[PDB]
Design a protein around this ligand. Structure first.
Ligand SMILES: CC(=O)N[C@@H]1[C@@H](O)[C@H](O)[C@@H](CO)S[C@@H]1OP(=O)(O)OP(=O)(O)OC[C@H]1O[C@@H](n2ccc(=O)[nH]c2=O)[C@H](O)[C@@H]1O
Length: 700
């Protein structure tokens, strides 16, 4: 029977559908003032408080809801989500398991339990629990879409086309019902959704930040109109949770120190605590100001701090990735706010003005897939610190064994001095001043092979320190992660990774989720046309290896055609790319950071640009490099380009030499020029704002 508080609860339910969140709270609270023992009112109020970010208070009402109704399995599940958001994964897990034990048919708890496993890398366990959730509730969009991503990570392509068809129909149905899509924005690049669908997904998720900041009830920030208080300097703020041992940091760590201190004042806002790595040290020691916002949990106070610094241009280096605090940008503490480098997609949000990209990555004809205005960098928006992090890979030498450049490679800072101690060093000349020292098969050469085959850590030849490529972490762990430059000479051989000493090696060091059935089929075609070639992949994760292999068998490839390797330390991973002949980029989602890694090794990369940002980054990197003949307009051209590289050995030599020279001469790895071009772009933005205009496209 309906009571008095029962009506108030129903009234607030309506307000929650209307979107009028704040009034729903008042009605939920008024209902609890009438009936303090109202379990449903407690659960509902807490569900709203959770949306508002008031987690501690939501947790309070969740416990009360359970004290009143001990069989409220739905209250357990929601309390877990709150605890999961409160970084108490321990307590969250307990809530889910308790819920399942009370009601084994409660599908939502099984789904939430699977999400915990998924976030913890336990993919097979996550898949198992998602299937249980779906077996209980067949119409479960959140579970289905999460399972879809789980199957993507491990390359489970069972009913792939049917699965893609349903994913789209789910997002479409949800967008037409005006509900939050079950597909995460960072995952939208993987599915055959429309451009409109993806931007809509980004928009819906952006609006989640609005709810969390509206409760603060903060007035609009008064923004600077000039550079007077800043002494004629533009104040640029870089907001990231990746200042440390993270891919983002690797690319841009040099950039803040290379800014012009006469025109710019750099502020780095860290969303993560100090991990002690050298990457964090460099940025802290080179940025004009370093602010640890990880010690400022409240978005209101954090945004206040940003505004109190007088930031003109605030930069979002996270977007929709792990550790992002987009509530900061939603509060708009800066007059100009831009997306940069970190997130390969649109934010879909009103509180984001520009997105720093380029002509190649984001051509003007597809600007309608972004919500922000386009802000073109001259060449490519992408950057890497490979010139600074791995200067020992700038020059190499090889060992002959009866001349190839990827069988037995030696790198080192004092490498040229080591070669001068050797009697019969051959100097092979590259074409388009460059050379490649070749060591003949003598006593010294055999001593090195001995170290490799035996599995020794290191040896000493003529006083020089000759190190094993597989033992970099046992000699200098700092050099292994890339925090330091190796102070010894490192030997890298194909035998170390089980690669055949006489075969064409196609490599792809990306995570396995980037591969779809059409890509493996595309690669199988290449491998079949090049009989003496192999495909080099990584166990990323390892459980994807039996899956990838299985489909390769069905396409007609013997097992020995694809060779897997474990994930290596950062330095080893970049360096061992020297062993490959050609890198086959993934068309569904390009290798972004990994793309810069293979290029620094001088390894040519074949790519096929898609329509999404993430599927066009590699091609943007290649145009900047100067290798337009490595870009394919369709699948057939992709396969053709690779097949030619694997059969025309003199053509392969010309292209490999082209990448080896233009990785230094082109502006691709030039962090100094990139910074200046970025600065030039910053000023165009500010002058546009200072003139009294609202953000518009920047095409130089
Ligand atoms: C699609 C997408 O999300 N793109 C993002 C870009 O948009 C951002 O601009 C990049 C900067 O944040 S991050 C991201 O870049 P991606 O290119 O997807 O790489 P991802 O995040 O899988 O990890 C590769 C790392 O593992 C290291 N790595 C890899 C293999 C290995 O054996 N050893 C190793 O150290 C590599 O050296 C790298 O350090």
């Amino acid at each position: 029977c309906p009571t008095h508080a029962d009506s108030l609860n129903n009234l607030a339910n309506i307000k929650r559908e209307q979107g009028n969140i704040e009034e729903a709270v008042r009605l939920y609270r008024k209902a609890l003032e009438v009936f303090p023992e109202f379990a449903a009112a407690h659960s509902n109020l807490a569900s709203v408080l959770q949306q508002q970010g008031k987690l501690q208070e939501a947790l309070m009402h969740y416990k009360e809801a359970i004290r009143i109704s001990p069989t409220f399995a739905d209250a357990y599940s929601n309390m877990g989500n709150t605890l999961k958001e409160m970084q108490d994964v321990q307590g969250a897990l307990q809530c889910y398991t308790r819920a399942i034990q009370i009601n084994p048919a409660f599908a939502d708890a099984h789904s939430n339990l699977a999400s915990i496993h998924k976030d913890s890398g336990n993919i097979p366990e996550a898949i198992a629990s998602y299937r249980t959730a779906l077996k209980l509730k067949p119409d479960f969009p959140d579970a289905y879409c999460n399972l879809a991503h789980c199957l993507q990570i491990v390359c489970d392509w069972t009913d792939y086309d049917e699965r893609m068809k349903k994913l789209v129909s789910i997002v479409a149905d949800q967008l037409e019902k005006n509900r939050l899509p079950s597909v995460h924005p960072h995952h939208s690049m993987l599915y055959p959704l429309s451009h409109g669908f993806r931007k809509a997904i980004a928009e819906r998720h952006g609006n989640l930040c609005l709810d969390k900041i509206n409760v603060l009830h903060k007035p609009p920030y008064e923004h600077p109109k000039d550079l007077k208080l800043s002494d004629g300097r533009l104040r640029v703020g870089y907001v990231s949770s990746d200042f440390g041992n993270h891919p983002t940091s690797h690319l841009m760590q040099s950039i803040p120190g290379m800014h012009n201190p006469d025109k710019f004042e750099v502020f780095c806002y860290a969303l993560s605590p100090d991990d002690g790595t050298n990457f964090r040290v460099k940025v802290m020691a080179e940025a004009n100001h370093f602010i640890d916002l990880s010690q400022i949990p409240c978005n209101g106070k954090a945004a206040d701090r940003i505004h109190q610094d007088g930031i003109h241009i605030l930069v979002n280096m996270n977007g929709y990735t792990k550790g992002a605090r987009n509530e900061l940008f939603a509060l708009r503490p800066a007059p100009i706010q831009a997306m940069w480098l970190g997130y390969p997609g649109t934010s879909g949000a009103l509180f984001m003005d520009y997105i720093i990209t380029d002509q190649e990555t984001s051509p003007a004809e597809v600007a309608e897939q972004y919500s922000e205005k386009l802000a073109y960098m001259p060449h490519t928006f992408f950057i890497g610190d490979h010139a600074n992090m791995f200067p020992h890979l700038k020059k190499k030498a090889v060992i002959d064994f009866k001349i190839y450049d990827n069988r037995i490679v030696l790198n080192g800072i004092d490498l040229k001095a080591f070669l001068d101690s050797l009697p019969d060093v051959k100097i092979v000349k590259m074409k388009c001043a460059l050379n490649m020292p070749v060591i003949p098969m003598n006593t010294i050469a055999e001593a090195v092979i001995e170290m490799i085959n035996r599995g020794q850590i290191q040896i000493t030849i003529n006083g020089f320190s000759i190190s094993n490529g597989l033992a970099t972490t046992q000699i200098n762990n700092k050099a292994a992660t890339g925090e330091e430059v190796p102070r010894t000479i490192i030997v890298t051989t194909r035998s170390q990774y089980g690669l055949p000493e006489d075969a064409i090696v196609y490599c792809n060091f990306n995570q396995l989720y980037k591969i779809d059935p059409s890509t493996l089929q595309m690669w199988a075609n290449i491998l079949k046309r090049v009989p003496n070639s192999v495909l080099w992949l990584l166990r990323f994760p390892a459980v994807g290896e039996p899956n990838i292999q299985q489909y390769a068998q069905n396409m007609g490839l013997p097992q020995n055609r694809i060779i897997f390797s474990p994930v290596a330390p950062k330095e080893e991973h970049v360096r061992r790319g020297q062993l490959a002949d050609v890198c086959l980029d993934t068309p569904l989602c390009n290798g972004h950071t990994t793309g810069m890694d293979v290029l620094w090794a001088g390894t040519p990369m074949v790519t096929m640009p898609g329509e999404t940002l993430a599927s066009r980054v590699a091609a943007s990197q290649l145009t900047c490099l100067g290798c337009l003949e490595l870009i394919a307009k369709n699948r057939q051209e992709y396969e053709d380009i690779a097949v030619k590289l694997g059969t025309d050995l003199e053509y392969l030599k010309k292209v490999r030499g082209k990448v080896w020279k233009q990785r230094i001469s082109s502006p691709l790895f030039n962090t100094k020029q990139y910074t200046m071009e970025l600065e030039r772009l910053y000023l165009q933005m500010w002058e546009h704002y200072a003139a009294g205009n609202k953000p518009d496209h920047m095409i130089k």
